């Protein structure tokens, strides 16, 4: 899918006022060095969607986390035609949060 047709303004408002607080709430001050970055909003959304909604070994429940459920819904609602180790969960969550930062700082 190409996230380029997404309503980024709506999505931004959802992230800033909801999803952001969910992510930071789960991390509770824990932080990690980031791994991947992105240079455009569509490209960032692509990484975000993949990291957020595909479960990984050691954190199968990631796509079921509150921040994750809201993300899925935000894309569905605002993008056209869009279809266990705790430390691992946190690590991925930290990555996702930092991708949001890149999203916010990247051009449309």
């Amino acid at each position: 899918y190409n996230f380029s047709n997404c309503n980024f303004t709506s999505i931004t408002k959802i992230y800033c006022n909801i999803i952001f607080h969910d992510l930071t709430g789960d991390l509770k001050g824990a932080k990690f060095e980031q791994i991947e970055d992105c240079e455009s909003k569509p490209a960032c959304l692509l990484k975000i969607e993949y990291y957020t909604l595909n479960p990984i070994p050691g954190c199968p429940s990631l796509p079921d986390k509150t921040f994750a459920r809201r993300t899925r819904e935000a894309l569905n609602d605002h993008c056209p035609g869009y279809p266990e180790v705790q430390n691992i969960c946190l690590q991925q969550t930290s990555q996702i949060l930092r991708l949001w930062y890149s999203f916010m700082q990247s051009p449309e």
Binding site: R98, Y101, M104, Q105
Partner: protein, 170 residues
């Protein structure tokens, strides 16, 4: 403790004999371009250029090459903006005061506007917040004198929790 500040997305300043290497992305590590030195010569810190994109990896090593500090984040993660350049105050007919200022050359900042009676203390500052590049402060008495000051504060959701607000304007 070590400190890192990214000044206005222009430079990165690292403050802590230690040596600093750095790189953006996955290229080759490079030495600090400009150390801060003591009279004896012990390093006190480092300044390097800030990049708007790519991950800044920092490696601070003690006399012996042992790792004492590591980091990997966008440079903007440590953002400290410059203060707003010049603040304007306009009494409206509503009885409100409109505070305005020039925009920064990048997005993701909130501005904090403080006011108080000009006779009041340093503990009497009232705060309001909003996006660029102006906001309204209501309920002020037109015959009293007020002091105003402004700083730019990076949005947590935009830059993260490691960013910091600028100094207050005069």
């Amino acid at each position: 403790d070590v400190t890192v500040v990214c000044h206005d997305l222009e430079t990165v300043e690292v403050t802590w004999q230690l040596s600093l290497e750095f790189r953006y992305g996955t290229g080759a590590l490079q030495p600090c371009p400009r150390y801060f030195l003591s009279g004896a010569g012990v390093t006190s810190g480092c300044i390097l250029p800030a990049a708007r994109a790519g991950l800044l990896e920092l490696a601070l090593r003690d006399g012996g090459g042992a790792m004492v500090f590591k980091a990997r984040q966008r440079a903007s993660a440590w953002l400290k903006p410059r203060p707003p350049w010049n603040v304007t105050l306009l009494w409206t007919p509503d009885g409100d005061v409109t505070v305005s200022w020039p925009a920064h050359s990048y997005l993701g900042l909130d501005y904090e506007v403080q006011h108080r009676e000009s006779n009041d203390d340093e503990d009497a500052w009232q705060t309001t917040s909003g996006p660029c590049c102006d906001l309204t402060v209501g309920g002020l008495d037109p015959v009293r004198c007020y002091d105003f000051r402004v700083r730019a504060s990076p949005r947590a959701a935009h830059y993260g929790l490691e960013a910091q607000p600028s100094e207050w304007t005069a």
